[PDB]
Enzyme design. Structure first.
Site, PDB file in Angstrom:
ATOM      1  N   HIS A 136       7.425  19.694 -19.737  1.00 32.17           N
ATOM      2  CA  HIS A 136       7.146  19.228 -18.393  1.00 32.17           C
ATOM      3  C   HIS A 136       7.950  18.004 -17.954  1.00 32.17           C
ATOM      4  O   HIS A 136       8.128  17.783 -16.754  1.00 32.17           O
ATOM      5  CB  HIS A 136       5.654  18.968 -18.218  1.00 32.17           C
ATOM      6  CG  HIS A 136       4.815  20.200 -18.293  1.00 32.17           C
ATOM      7  ND1 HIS A 136       5.143  21.365 -17.632  1.00 32.17           N
ATOM      8  CD2 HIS A 136       3.638  20.438 -18.917  1.00 32.17           C
ATOM      9  CE1 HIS A 136       4.218  22.280 -17.874  1.00 32.17           C
ATOM     10  NE2 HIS A 136       3.291  21.740 -18.646  1.00 32.17           N
ATOM     11  N   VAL A 188      22.631  28.042 -20.030  1.00 34.63           N
ATOM     12  CA  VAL A 188      21.246  28.168 -20.498  1.00 34.63           C
ATOM     13  C   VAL A 188      20.412  29.136 -19.665  1.00 34.63           C
ATOM     14  O   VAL A 188      20.202  28.930 -18.454  1.00 34.63           O
ATOM     15  CB  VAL A 188      20.501  26.813 -20.559  1.00 34.63           C
ATOM     16  CG1 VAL A 188      19.172  26.996 -21.269  1.00 34.63           C
ATOM     17  CG2 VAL A 188      21.329  25.760 -21.272  1.00 34.63           C
TER      18      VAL A 188
HETATM   19 CA   LIG Z   1      19.884  28.511 -16.174  1.00 32.95          CA
HETATM   20 ZN   LIG Z   2       0.802  23.922 -21.629  1.00 34.04          ZN
END
Ligand SMILES: [Ca+2]
Ligand SMILES: [Zn+2]
Ligand SMILES: [Ca+2]
Length: 369
Positions: A136, A188
């Site tokens: 996060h 990525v």
């Molecule tokens: Ca990406």
């Molecule tokens: Zn979580």
């Protein structure tokens, strides 16, 4: 592909960090995890390392000088001198200031990166850092119990020797931090399976697919309450397979957030440890440099079982369901077994829904070269 060399990162101090009275995130669960796998005799089959403390230099490869600078300075003794900067950096409630905050980030981050560096050097097939997986955390902001984004930094490290890195995130929550960091690149691919609909962090729609050079290099599988083993296994392998076929990464990062288990205090899924671990089994079969991290998880007995089992899976080492005696034996009552039972909650994810979402992601995946 044979048995694989596993390297494993753990700092004995990690369980001593305390988010505060009532906070669901309990760094103690990693020590329980550690103790459980130790007592099963799993240290015999893998190399154990104590991560170094990652530095601000390391952290700022992604994060802004100002946000790290802040994390380094903020303490409970000096809070009221930083109210503004706290608010700026979303440090205050969800992501409390506690004793040792920064060092905790350092050790959390140090395993992820040491794991990557080890994989880079071709010295292990798999690296395990359960203190990491804090998906996060954002460039200049803390979020959802995470401060420093060890995954991103780890991927920044893998990108040194790998053109393409695959990030998969089976935490119940969406990997927004990782997705965000890599939203505009094809170097990525990020794949998150998660609860979606009036649920933190609010992002991760099916239609979120990347942007610019990275269009179709972000993939999201929004799910409902009560998903189970058969439903999850119905779609995980087919999707991971297609992704491997089309994207062809040379390194994988696998966030194994355990809050997707049945009975999680914050979660609303209905997977077992076995169902959860099936994901690790599937990614394993591809035989690529694989970094495994932790993440969410708030019914801590179940977290311990989950990551103990998944370390054993990394090792292809069968372990009995009968829990060995350990320093936290009483946390595992009233059964003292390794494996869990699903609850009787309704699965809101119809077989049809699962097939439909998977067919839509298939469409998206056709768009790669
Ligand atoms: Ca990406
Ligand atoms: Zn979580
Ligand atoms: Ca996820």
């Amino acid at each position: 592909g044979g048995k694989k060399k596993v390297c494993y990162y753990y700092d004995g101090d990690i369980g001593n960090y305390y988010y505060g009275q009532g906070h669901p995130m309990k760094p103690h669960r990693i020590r329980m995890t550690h103790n459980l796998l130790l007592n099963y005799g799993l240290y015999r089959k893998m190399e154990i390392y104590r991560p170094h403390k990652a530095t601000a230099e390391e952290m700022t490869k992604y994060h802004s000088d100002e946000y790290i600078k802040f994390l380094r300075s903020i303490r409970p003794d000096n809070m009221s001198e930083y109210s503004k900067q706290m608010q700026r950096f979303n440090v205050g409630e969800d992501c409390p200031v506690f004793d040792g905050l920064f060092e905790f980030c350092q050790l959390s981050t140090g395993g992820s990166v040491a794991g990557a560096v080890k994989l880079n050097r071709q010295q292990t097939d798999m690296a395990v850092n359960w203190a990491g997986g804090l998906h996060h955390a954002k460039k200049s902001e803390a979020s959802g119990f995470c401060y420093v984004n060890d995954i991103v930094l780890a991927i920044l490290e893998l990108l040194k020797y790998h053109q393409r890195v695959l990030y998969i995130d089976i935490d119940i929550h969406h990997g927004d931090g990782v997705e965000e960091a890599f939203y505009t690149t094809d170097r990525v691919m990020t794949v998150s399976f998660h609860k979606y609909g009036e649920y933190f962090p609010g992002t991760g729609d099916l239609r979120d697919i990347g942007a610019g050079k990275g269009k179709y290099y972000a993939v999201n599988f929004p799910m409902r309450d009560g998903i189970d083993d058969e439903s999850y296994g119905q779609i995980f392998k087919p999707i991971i397979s297609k992704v491997m076929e089309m994207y062809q990464p040379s390194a994988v990062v696998l966030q194994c957030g355990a809050d997707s288990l049945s009975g999680d205090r914050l979660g609303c899924f209905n997977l077992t440890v076995k169902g959860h671990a099936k994901c690790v089994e599937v990614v394993k079969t591809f035989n690529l440099p694989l970094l495994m991290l932790g993440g969410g998880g708030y019914t801590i007995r179940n977290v311990a079982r989950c990551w103990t089992y998944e370390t054993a899976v990394a090792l292809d080492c069968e372990i009995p369901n009968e829990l060995p005696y350990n320093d936290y034996f009483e946390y595992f009552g009233p059964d003292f077994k390794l494996h869990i039972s699903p609850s009787n909650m309704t699965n809101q994810n119809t077989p049809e829904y699962m097939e439909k979402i998977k067919q839509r992601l298939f469409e998206n995946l056709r768009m790669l070269p």
